[PDB]
Amino acid sequence: SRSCGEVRQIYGAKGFSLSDVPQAEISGEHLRICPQGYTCCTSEMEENLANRSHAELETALRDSSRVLQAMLATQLRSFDDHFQHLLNDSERTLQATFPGAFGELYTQNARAFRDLYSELRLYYRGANLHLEETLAEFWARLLERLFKQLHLGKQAEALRPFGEAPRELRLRATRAFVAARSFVQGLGVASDVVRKVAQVPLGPECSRAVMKLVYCAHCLGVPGARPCPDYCRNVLKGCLANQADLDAEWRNLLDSMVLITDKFWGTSGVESVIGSVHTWLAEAINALQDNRDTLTAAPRERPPSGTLEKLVSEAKAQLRDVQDFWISLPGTLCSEKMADDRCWNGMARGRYLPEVMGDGLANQINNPEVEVDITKPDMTIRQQIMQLKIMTNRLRSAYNGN
Ligand SMILES: *[C@@H]1O[C@H](CO)[C@@H](O)[C@H](O)[C@H]1NC(C)=O
Ligand SMILES: [Ca+2]
Ligand SMILES: [Ca+2]
């Protein structure tokens, strides 16, 4: 009713000077952002409120992004730590139980096994290695020394003195270790992408659009009004479009990542080789000492649910939950922090007629609330899309045994 007392309240409680707000409505000819009409807002008040709304949206965005980063980091640490512990507990179990069973056979060769575990370790960490060739070399030297303590051209390979254990170990390790490494690496790349995209600032366009969205209701004399859901969604879809462009490759990455988890195990019944290597080694040694005089001429059931299995289930739940993130941002921010027949449509309290825009940069060309340039995409987002592409390629090749 042309008394600005309510607006004076809100402006003052937001920590701005009460000096600048008039007692009655004045001509809004001076308004740059808000639709020109009789208003309680001074230009001062207008730019201040715009700045504030901008800051608020930024804070929201960074909050969401930080939540996502937190989740991804947690998953990363979890899987890395568990893989490494599995390898490690395998080695320590080997060191503990081997001298008893195999005696001097292991006792004299221990450096070979230690070195092998070191090789597997370096491989998981992403060093360049041919695991096939490494294992082959290992079996060659080990066979040499073992044959020497049992009592050049070697007939031995193709006479399979160690049995099927070397083959099993080769296949299983080759699959599982590249699976694990690729998965962890994928988590890392996801985290980095989110962290880098969070840094991309909002433009002046988005600023004026958000100001018109939020506090222009107050300026035009209807401060009790809160934005219509479709209005807010259009404004945010216009602001976040470049971020929305990440959707495709984000989804591809996450899909390939929930795909690669299946390769942590071979086909059914046997526990993952990643923690069970020592076991196949023992199998091989036993098979050799079984073949000792002809040459002179333990892989336990998989538990119904194991640690790695539970971690994988939880992780797949998380990834399935966050796959829609980039396009889910506007609805999420609008639902939680930004917003009953009559609501603020931006010219008055009423209905918002305009149809909601589609996702992505290109779809914002006709966006009524915000003016967006679709010709030049944000190239940071583009960089990150490239990263997603590359990591996805790595994971797809890893899934194919490549
Ligand atoms: C397991 O093995 C390596 C070798 O010392 C070590 O760096 C790592 O910290 C150990 N602990 C775990 C669970 O990573
Ligand atoms: Ca979701
Ligand atoms: Ca336009």
Residue numbers in the entry: 29 to 179, 192 to 337, 365 to 406, 412 to 474
Which sentences from the paper describe this structure?
Glypicans are heparan sulfate proteoglycans that are attached to the cell-membrane surface by glycosylphosphatidylinositol anchorage. Glypican-1 (Gpc-1) is the predominant heparan sulfate proteoglycan in the developing and adult human brain and is involved in regulation of neurogenesis, axon guidance and synaptogenesis. Recently, we determined the crystal structure of N-glycosylated human glypican-1 core protein at 2.55 Å resolution, which revealed a cylindrical all-α-helical fold (dimensions 120 × 30 × 30 Å) decorated with three major loops and containing the 14 cysteine residues that are conserved in all members of the glypican family. A study has been carried out to establish whether controlled dehydration could be used to improve the anisotropy of crystals of the core protein of the human proteoglycan glypican-1.
The best diffraction data set (2.46 Å resolution) was collected from a crystal dehydrated using the script (86%, 0.1%, 30 s) with a total incubation time of 65 min. These data had an anisotropy ΔB of 13.6 Å2 when checked with the UCLA MBI Diffraction Anisotropy Server, while the control data, without dehydration, had a strong anisotropy ΔB of 40.7 Å2. Also, the Wilson B factor was reduced by 25% to 36.8 Å2, which reveals significant improvement in the degree of short-range lattice order in the crystal after dehydration. After dehydration the overall model B factor fell from 73.8 to 61.4 Å2, which is in better agreement with the corresponding values found in 700 structures refined at the same resolution (using phenix.polygon). Shrinkage of the unit cell after dehydration leads to tighter packing, decreasing the flexible areas and forming new lattice contacts, mainly along the c axis. The new density maps allowed the building of more complete models for all of the Gpc-1 monomers in the asymmetric unit and displayed well defined side-chain density, allowing more reliable side-chain placement. In the dehydrated Gpc-1 crystals the orientation with respect to each other of the pairs of chains A/B and C/D is preserved (almost no rotation and <1 Å translation of B relative to A), while the pair C/D undergoes an almost pure translation of about 11 Å relative to A/B. This translation results in the creation of a new intermolecular interface. The trans­lation peak, now at (½, 0.0742, ½), increases to 42% of the height of the origin peak. Together with the reduction in the β angle from 94.6 to 90.8°, this suggests an ongoing transition to face-­centred orthorhombic symmetry, but within the range of parameters investigated here we did not achieve a complete transition.
